């Protein structure tokens, strides 16, 4: 019964907000019919909330977004494990990954909420990982440098090796920061949408080196006015 608000919104309120499909000004894109939108923050948060109620009841969505000049950190891991046995992401492993990306981003421009999601498993090639860090806004060539550093990173390789992963590298696509991403809950073609395991938080010092929030709005890269997260 609910979801009808979404089509009513798209047809009536969002109709005036047309955007060219090939234009770079668009921020939220749906691949169901190839619609591209460049909405301001108001209907952005409105659609975030609406997608949240939709995911509360279920359904399948196929929305996408492209990172602009300012955005968070969203990465894709193609972890093709040797066997289809779940290496559950223990808190020590997530802490190791967070510390490694921390020390990776220290030697760059500096002035944090961590969200972890994984596959529903039972699939060839095992699962993948998508870490989302929308706190800061450093979408530039520094992101490409960080991508190269993680490609040359070795600690994450042994962290995956501790999980019995036969793909220490090549899981992170080299175009991770140069291609559009998808909001949390946006499923894949003939694939179940991902699920969150745990969401932690921390803070960085310039000198010394879960069901209580609108998760879609907080995790959005273009949403600066989120409650749980802040635009660092």
């Amino acid at each position: 019964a609910e979801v009808q608000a979404l089509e009513t919104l798209l047809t009536r309120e969002l109709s005036v907000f047309l955007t060219e499909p090939g234009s770079k000004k668009t921020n939220i894109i749906n691949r169901i019919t190839g619609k591209t939108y460049a909405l301001p923050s108001t209907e952005l948060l409105r659609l975030y909330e609406h997608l949240e109620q939709c995911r509360k009841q279920g359904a399948l969505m196929y929305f996408l977004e492209r990172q602009g000049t300012y955005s968070g950190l969203m990465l894709d891991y193609d972890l093709k494990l040797n066997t289809n046995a779940v290496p559950p992401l223990e808190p020590p492993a997530l802490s190791r990954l967070c510390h490694r990306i921390f020390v990776h981003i220290k030697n760059s421009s500096v002035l944090i909420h961590f969200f972890f999601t994984l596959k529903p498993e039972v699939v060839q090639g095992k699962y993948g990982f998508h870490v989302l860090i929308p706190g800061l806004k450093l979408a530039a060539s520094t992101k490409k440098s960080i991508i190269g550093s993680l490609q040359h990173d070795a600690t994450v390789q042994k962290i995956l090796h501790e999980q019995g992963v036969t793909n220490p590298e090549s899981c992170l696509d080299p175009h991770s920061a140069s291609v559009p991403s998808l909001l949390y809950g946006s499923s894949k073609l003939n694939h179940k949408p991902y699920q969150l395991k745990t969401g932690f938080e921390l803070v960085f010092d310039s000198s010394d080196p879960l069901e209580s929030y609108n998760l879609v709005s907080e995790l959005s890269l273009t949403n600066e006015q989120g409650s749980l997260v802040r635009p660092v």
Partner: protein, 139 residues
């Protein structure tokens, strides 16, 4: 339904009485539709308005589900007992009556009623009366 149909395409169909007292339908041929050679941009005789049936079955659903969406949106807002009883009953009756437009007898009745609305007095005897106009294959 006949009045709404005439409102949306009162300019493409006309009806006149022949010498035998039989209603006759005429359709104004437009480019981009199936048609013989040479009758573009001019009227043609129609024994039975097939295009009218196709339209009333296909394009009327647009206004039908648009008004259904409007009723749903108006029901969304909170009010007094009116939304609990009157709008619910209206929506039930309307969704019951929505499927009528796909019936055959209903369509025949609608066409028979619209014959009166599409009537145009003095059309057959004024047809092809201008000596300076000559219909050709290009218009």
């Amino acid at each position: 339904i006949a009045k709404v149909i005439y409102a949306m395409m009162g300019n493409k169909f006309v009806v006149d009485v022949d010498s035998n007292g039989k209603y006759v339908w005429f359709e104004f041929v437009l480019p981009g539709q199936p048609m013989n050679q040479g009758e573009i941009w001019k009227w043609r005789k129609e024994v039975n308005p097939d295009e009218l049936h196709i339209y009333i079955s296909e394009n009327f659903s647009r206004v039908m589900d648009r008004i259904t969406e409007h009723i749903k949106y108006h029901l969304s807002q909170p009010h007094e007992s009116n939304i609990l009883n009157y709008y619910k009953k209206l929506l039930k009756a309307f969704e019951r009556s929505k499927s009528k437009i796909f019936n055959d007898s209903f369509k025949k009745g609608v066409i028979r009623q619209a014959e009166f609305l599409f009537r145009q007095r003095s059309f057959i005897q004024t047809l092809d009366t201008n000596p300076h106009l000559l219909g050709v294959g290009n218009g």
